[PDB]
Amino acid sequence: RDSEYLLQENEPDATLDQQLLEDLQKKKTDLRYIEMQRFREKLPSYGMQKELVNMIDNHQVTVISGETGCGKTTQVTQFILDNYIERGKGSACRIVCTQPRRISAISVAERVAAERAESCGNGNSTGYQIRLQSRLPRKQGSILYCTTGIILQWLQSDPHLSSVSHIVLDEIHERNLQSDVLMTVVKDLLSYRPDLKVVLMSATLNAEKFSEYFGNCPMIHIPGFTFPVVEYLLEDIIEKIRYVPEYYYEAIYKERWPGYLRELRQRYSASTVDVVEMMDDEKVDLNLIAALIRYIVLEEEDGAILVFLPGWDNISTLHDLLMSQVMFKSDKFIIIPLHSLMPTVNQTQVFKRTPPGVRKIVIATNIAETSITIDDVVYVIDGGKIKETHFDTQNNISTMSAEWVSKANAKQRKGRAGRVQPGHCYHLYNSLRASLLDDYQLPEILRTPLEELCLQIKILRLGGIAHFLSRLMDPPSNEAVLLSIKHLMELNALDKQEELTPLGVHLARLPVEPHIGKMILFGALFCCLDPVLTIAASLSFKDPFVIPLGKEKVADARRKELAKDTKSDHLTVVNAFKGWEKAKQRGFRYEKDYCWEYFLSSNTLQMLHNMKGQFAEHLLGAGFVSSRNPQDPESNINSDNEKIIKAVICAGLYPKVAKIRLNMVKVYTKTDGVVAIHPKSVNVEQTEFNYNWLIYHLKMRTSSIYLYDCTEVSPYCLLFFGGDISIQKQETIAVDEWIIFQSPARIAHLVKELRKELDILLQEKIESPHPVDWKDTKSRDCAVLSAIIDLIKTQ
Ligand SMILES: Nc1ncnc2c1ncn2[C@@H]1O[C@H](COP(=O)(O)OP(=O)(O)O)[C@@H](O)[C@H]1O
Ligand code: ALF
């Protein structure tokens, strides 16, 4: 797949060493190369060139620290390569550098290539590799930037990374789940790769923690700053622009709050102290950010502005807040949102230069807080908050919320300025808030569901999940991991013996949560891709329905209208999405009339459309579809069948099942007991159900359990995609004991055999995956899927 660079053989030779040495000497007479070197010599890392190379050359593992923008990411790789080339051994270099995000790997590779007077990829010295996109460099004497997900995928093809000579783990402070896994895998690999060199780099790092973890490996600090960046706290921001607004650590904040205000009145005007007193800790003040942006463009010198917001809802709100003003309507401004859910083509536009009279304003999430360098950025506005997932071990409920930024994230955000020229960073938290921020975010492995952790451990054949936990830098609790094992068994991704099923193999290859991965996989298998990807896109992110202040009743009636007779919150989103695409074909004014009439968010709908393309790419790289288009005819033969779609929904949401009792309707969920239906759902006032079963995705606990989104489902969908099957008594079938319904006992025998055929189908798909040819009709794989579909259609 994406392992072309990996599965090459590292074959150094002296003749290619001489060609690289001569080419390097020829570069030193090229004007463009010479001018780039003038810029490189200004970086603090350039002064450490001999010291950095000598340490990497004498030690297997090296921890490199340095100030933001000191040059690690773009220079250290070049220092290793150019040192080898100058020593006459350049062909022995196969340097791989990991980046946490795709926008980092692309832009850094393009920048390094330009610093070497070369294009990126094209068999030159530098290139990049990401999911389904690559610019690959030459075989020997080369640098490859990639994502950590790429390296994890490589470990499935070569657990030893045999052809790589240097692996550079960058931004290691970003303790994301995959990075911690990769870091532990690299540590185990050292003894099996005595020839491999490992470099660990971060600008904001407890470097002794990583040194100690890697056997007290040597540390080296790159001293110096590139350009000064002035910092401002909330009181300083309010003082400068004269702005007037139109768990235990919080107890400390409240205790020190009155004394802090007193000490503040001695250093700031009373107006600003009163404003600090009434500022809101719950959400980011978008009006203040807009007012600060107005002040910068009207009173400060030229330079792009970069704004950090928690999520997409804040970005679009601020964007509309600016665009509603006459000043920002003109072509003197180019306002660019930046979100990880945007297509990579859209993310790269942030790096395009602006005309001299044009001010660039980038509104980004934490996607932009590390690695990347934006040329004209001079002003950084730090909203002070960051989206974080959190996990509670009392119920299967994980929450994503906007938390206070840590000091490391703040330093990384400040570091986006001061790279090519001086800059200013504005932090929207007061000084008392600053003293109570944490140094780093809690590692993601300690606060998220761990289903992907267990799938990753199993697909990489790393051994027992207990032994691997003991090797992690920060191991999660056993109960959290055991809870993930149980969830993966209920999804039938693991069998009773904690071993990957055929389905579990494909789910581990899909870079999404297995509930979503199982849904889009069977949407591709059952040829109903487009409606399922729309449902999957809305289960991730959010649904596109909004409720203005009112008068929720008229918005309710619109939602039930879009549901038709489906009794499905998820088919409602599909109908709302399909009507939106058709409204767009009519015209822009009529598209707005559609969104206003049905209380739909065009911004959310466009975001959902982007995510559908990303899901199809995942299925394309996994071999289950033939193109990146979610509406490919080859994947949508059954896209108009509500029963088949609802089965795929059930395939994804099981075991989140609810039972309906009548006479007056009551709902039960085995784990929570009696639940209720969220008033936003279309099934709140429903008393007529064709079936007594619902599937759901989101649960909200407010002293009462509400199912946010649910669809009625036939017991035969639960029978096939459920758990254990038992026949009771006096002729009933049971699914996981509690799901009981009267049915001929031989149906249970049929489902056991069809499940087995489905496993055989997925097993044959493991080696070389190709999409099911739904035009063959007379094929084994199509006959199996048709038999399952026939069972779903009729009892
Ligand atoms: N696309 C670019 N345009 C202009 N200058 C750049 C670009 N990319 C990097 N630089 C310069 O090269 C330096 C290298 O940055 P980087 O290697 O990312 O440093 P670090 O990894 O320490 O943050 C930056 O400080 C910046 O000044
Ligand atoms: F150290 Al950086 F972007 F990686 F400032």
Short mmCIF file of all heavy atoms in Angstrom, two decimals, residues 66-73 99 170-171 173 202-204 369-373 411-412 415-416 419, ligand 2, unseen atoms left out:
data_model
loop_
_atom_site.label_atom_id
_atom_site.label_comp_id
_atom_site.label_asym_id
_atom_site.label_seq_id
_atom_site.Cartn_x
_atom_site.Cartn_y
_atom_site.Cartn_z
N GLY A 66 15.06 22.12 22.04
CA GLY A 66 15.41 23.43 21.53
C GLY A 66 14.20 24.32 21.51
O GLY A 66 13.06 23.85 21.56
N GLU A 67 14.46 25.62 21.45
CA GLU A 67 13.37 26.59 21.45
C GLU A 67 12.51 26.43 20.20
O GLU A 67 12.93 25.84 19.20
CB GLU A 67 13.92 28.01 21.54
CG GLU A 67 14.81 28.27 22.75
CD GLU A 67 14.08 28.11 24.07
OE1 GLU A 67 12.87 28.42 24.12
OE2 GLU A 67 14.72 27.68 25.05
N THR A 68 11.29 26.95 20.27
CA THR A 68 10.39 26.91 19.12
C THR A 68 11.01 27.64 17.94
O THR A 68 11.52 28.76 18.08
CB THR A 68 9.04 27.52 19.47
OG1 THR A 68 9.23 28.67 20.30
CG2 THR A 68 8.17 26.51 20.21
N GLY A 69 10.98 27.01 16.77
CA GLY A 69 11.57 27.60 15.59
C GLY A 69 13.08 27.62 15.56
O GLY A 69 13.65 28.34 14.73
N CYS A 70 13.74 26.87 16.44
CA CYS A 70 15.20 26.83 16.43
C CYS A 70 15.74 26.10 15.21
O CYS A 70 16.88 26.35 14.80
CB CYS A 70 15.72 26.16 17.70
SG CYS A 70 15.37 24.40 17.81
N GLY A 71 14.96 25.19 14.62
CA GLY A 71 15.33 24.55 13.37
C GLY A 71 15.36 23.03 13.39
O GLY A 71 15.75 22.43 12.38
N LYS A 72 14.95 22.37 14.48
CA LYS A 72 15.12 20.92 14.59
C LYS A 72 14.49 20.18 13.41
O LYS A 72 15.15 19.39 12.74
CB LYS A 72 14.51 20.43 15.90
CG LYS A 72 15.17 20.96 17.16
CD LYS A 72 14.25 20.74 18.35
CE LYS A 72 12.90 21.39 18.10
NZ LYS A 72 11.80 20.68 18.79
N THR A 73 13.20 20.44 13.15
CA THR A 73 12.45 19.61 12.21
C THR A 73 13.04 19.65 10.81
O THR A 73 13.16 18.62 10.15
CB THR A 73 10.99 20.06 12.18
OG1 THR A 73 10.47 20.10 13.52
CG2 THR A 73 10.16 19.10 11.35
N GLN A 99 5.94 13.16 11.73
CA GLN A 99 5.20 14.35 12.11
C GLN A 99 3.84 13.95 12.65
O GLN A 99 3.26 12.95 12.20
CB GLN A 99 5.03 15.31 10.93
CG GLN A 99 6.34 15.86 10.38
CD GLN A 99 7.08 16.73 11.37
OE1 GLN A 99 6.59 17.77 11.79
NE2 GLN A 99 8.28 16.30 11.76
N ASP A 170 9.55 13.29 16.00
CA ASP A 170 9.42 14.71 16.29
C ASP A 170 8.15 14.98 17.09
O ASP A 170 7.19 14.20 17.07
CB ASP A 170 9.41 15.51 14.98
CG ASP A 170 9.78 16.97 15.19
OD1 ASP A 170 10.20 17.32 16.31
OD2 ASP A 170 9.65 17.75 14.23
N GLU A 171 8.15 16.11 17.80
CA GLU A 171 7.01 16.56 18.59
C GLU A 171 6.55 15.49 19.58
O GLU A 171 5.35 15.28 19.79
CB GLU A 171 5.85 17.00 17.69
CG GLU A 171 6.23 17.98 16.58
CD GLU A 171 6.48 19.39 17.06
OE1 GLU A 171 6.61 19.60 18.29
OE2 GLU A 171 6.53 20.30 16.22
N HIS A 173 6.40 15.43 22.61
CA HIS A 173 5.62 15.91 23.75
C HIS A 173 4.12 15.73 23.52
O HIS A 173 3.36 15.60 24.49
CB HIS A 173 5.93 17.38 24.02
CG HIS A 173 5.49 18.30 22.92
ND1 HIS A 173 6.31 18.64 21.86
CD2 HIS A 173 4.32 18.94 22.71
CE1 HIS A 173 5.66 19.45 21.05
NE2 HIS A 173 4.45 19.65 21.54
N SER A 202 11.71 17.66 20.73
CA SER A 202 10.56 18.48 21.10
C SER A 202 11.05 19.83 21.60
O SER A 202 12.14 19.94 22.16
CB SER A 202 9.70 17.82 22.17
OG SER A 202 8.61 18.66 22.51
N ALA A 203 10.22 20.85 21.40
CA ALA A 203 10.57 22.19 21.85
C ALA A 203 10.17 22.42 23.30
O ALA A 203 10.85 23.16 24.01
CB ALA A 203 9.92 23.24 20.94
N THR A 204 9.07 21.81 23.73
CA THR A 204 8.56 21.94 25.10
C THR A 204 8.53 20.54 25.69
O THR A 204 7.59 19.78 25.45
CB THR A 204 7.17 22.57 25.09
OG1 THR A 204 6.30 21.81 24.25
CG2 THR A 204 7.24 23.99 24.57
N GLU A 369 -0.63 24.33 15.88
CA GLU A 369 0.16 24.82 17.01
C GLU A 369 1.57 24.24 17.07
O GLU A 369 2.40 24.77 17.82
CB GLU A 369 -0.57 24.53 18.33
CG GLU A 369 -0.35 23.15 18.92
CD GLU A 369 -0.97 23.02 20.30
OE1 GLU A 369 -1.81 23.87 20.67
OE2 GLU A 369 -0.61 22.06 21.03
N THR A 370 1.88 23.19 16.31
CA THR A 370 3.22 22.64 16.28
C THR A 370 3.70 22.49 14.84
O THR A 370 2.92 22.51 13.89
CB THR A 370 3.31 21.27 16.99
OG1 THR A 370 2.53 20.30 16.27
CG2 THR A 370 2.81 21.36 18.42
N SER A 371 5.03 22.34 14.71
CA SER A 371 5.70 21.95 13.47
C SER A 371 5.63 23.00 12.36
O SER A 371 6.67 23.46 11.88
CB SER A 371 5.14 20.62 12.96
OG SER A 371 5.64 19.54 13.72
N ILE A 372 4.42 23.36 11.93
CA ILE A 372 4.28 24.14 10.71
C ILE A 372 4.77 25.57 10.91
O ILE A 372 4.74 26.12 12.02
CB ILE A 372 2.82 24.12 10.22
CG1 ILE A 372 1.92 24.89 11.19
CG2 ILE A 372 2.33 22.69 10.05
CD1 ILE A 372 0.51 25.07 10.68
N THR A 373 5.25 26.17 9.82
CA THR A 373 5.69 27.56 9.80
C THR A 373 4.92 28.29 8.71
O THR A 373 4.94 27.86 7.55
CB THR A 373 7.20 27.66 9.54
OG1 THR A 373 7.44 27.50 8.14
CG2 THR A 373 7.95 26.58 10.30
N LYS A 411 3.12 27.57 24.76
CA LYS A 411 4.45 27.86 24.23
C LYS A 411 4.55 27.47 22.76
O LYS A 411 5.23 28.15 21.98
CB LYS A 411 5.52 27.16 25.05
CG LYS A 411 5.79 27.81 26.40
N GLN A 412 3.89 26.38 22.37
CA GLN A 412 3.88 25.99 20.96
C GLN A 412 3.09 26.99 20.13
O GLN A 412 3.46 27.29 18.99
CB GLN A 412 3.31 24.58 20.81
CG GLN A 412 4.20 23.47 21.35
CD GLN A 412 5.40 23.19 20.46
OE1 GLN A 412 5.41 23.55 19.28
NE2 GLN A 412 6.42 22.55 21.02
N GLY A 415 5.06 30.02 19.66
CA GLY A 415 6.15 29.70 18.76
C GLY A 415 5.81 29.77 17.29
O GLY A 415 6.74 29.77 16.46
N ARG A 416 4.53 29.81 16.93
CA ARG A 416 4.16 29.99 15.53
C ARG A 416 4.59 31.35 15.00
O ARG A 416 4.79 31.50 13.79
CB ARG A 416 2.66 29.81 15.34
CG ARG A 416 2.14 28.39 15.62
CD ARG A 416 3.06 27.33 15.04
NE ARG A 416 3.96 26.80 16.06
CZ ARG A 416 5.03 26.05 15.79
NH1 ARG A 416 5.34 25.77 14.53
NH2 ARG A 416 5.80 25.61 16.77
N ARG A 419 9.33 33.09 13.92
CA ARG A 419 10.09 32.12 13.14
C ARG A 419 10.94 32.79 12.07
O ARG A 419 12.13 32.50 11.95
CB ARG A 419 9.14 31.10 12.51
CG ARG A 419 8.35 30.31 13.54
CD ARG A 419 7.63 29.13 12.91
NE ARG A 419 7.54 28.01 13.85
CZ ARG A 419 8.44 27.04 13.94
NH1 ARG A 419 9.49 27.04 13.14
NH2 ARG A 419 8.29 26.07 14.83
F1 ALF B 2 9.78 23.33 17.80
AL1 ALF B 2 8.47 23.64 16.63
F2 ALF B 2 7.17 23.94 15.45
F3 ALF B 2 8.47 21.91 16.18
F4 ALF B 2 8.47 25.37 17.07
#
